Amino acid sequence: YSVLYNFAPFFAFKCYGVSPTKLNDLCFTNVYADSFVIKGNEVSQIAPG
Amino acid sequence: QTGNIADYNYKLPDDFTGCVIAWNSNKLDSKHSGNYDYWYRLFRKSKLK
Ligand SMILES: *[C@@H]1O[C@H](CO)[C@@H](O[C@@H]2O[C@H](CO)[C@@H](O)[C@H](O)[C@H]2NC(C)=O)[C@H](O)[C@H]1NC(C)=O
């Protein structure tokens, strides 16, 4: 998760389900990652509900 | 119990004695268009005694 932490300015880091700090040891099998490009305000508009 | 809420906010003692009362209260705790007056801390340095 260093690349997620150090690489790129990571302008958006907000999330509500699982803490991004107590995550290095936490371990799953599959993760659904989707990539797309938007402007500044849509990044903020990205949210649940 | 292990997790986030039971690990940072409220930890029941291992040698607990007594009773636990549970009942769903949707009308008295939720309202239309969101109700996030309540707060639970999922970020803590360590587990809670
Ligand atoms: C509340 O007092 C307790 C003393 O028992 C302390 O809480 C611990 O603080 C250490 C660091 O000083 C942490 O590593 C532990 O994880 C803490 N444990 C708990 C259960 O909080 C501290 O002095 C006070 N805690 C806070 C958050 O101010």
UniProtKB/Swiss-Prot annotation, chain A:
It comes from the Viruses. Changing residue 4 to I: In strain: Omicron/XBB.1.5, Omicron/EG.5.1. Residues 39-41 are annotated as: Integrin-binding motif. Binds to host ACE2. RBD also interacts with the N-linked glycan on 'Asn-90' of ACE2. Cleavage of S generates a polybasic C-terminal sequence on S1 that binds to host Neuropilin-1 (NRP1) and Neuropilin-2 (NRP2) receptors. Interacts with host integrin alpha-5/beta-1 (ITGA5:ITGB1) and with ACE2 in complex with integrin alpha-5/beta-1 (ITGA5:ITGB1). May interact via cytoplasmic c-terminus with M protein. May interact (via N-terminus) with host bilirubin and biliverdin, thereby preventing antibody binding to the SARS-CoV-2 spike NTD via an allosteric mechanism. Attaches the virion to the cell membrane by interacting with host receptor, initiating the infection. The major receptor is host ACE2. When S2/S2' has been cleaved, binding to the receptor triggers direct fusion at the cell membrane. When S2/S2' has not been cleaved, binding to the receptor results in internalization of the virus by endocytosis using host TFRC and GRM2 and leading to fusion of the virion membrane with the host endosomal membrane. Alternatively, may use NRP1/NRP2 and integrin as entry receptors. This is Spike protein S1. It comes from Severe acute respiratory syndrome coronavirus 2. The lineage of its organism: Viruses, Riboviria, Orthornavirae, Pisuviricota, Pisoniviricetes. The gene is S. The chain holds residues 365 to 413 of 1273 of the full protein.
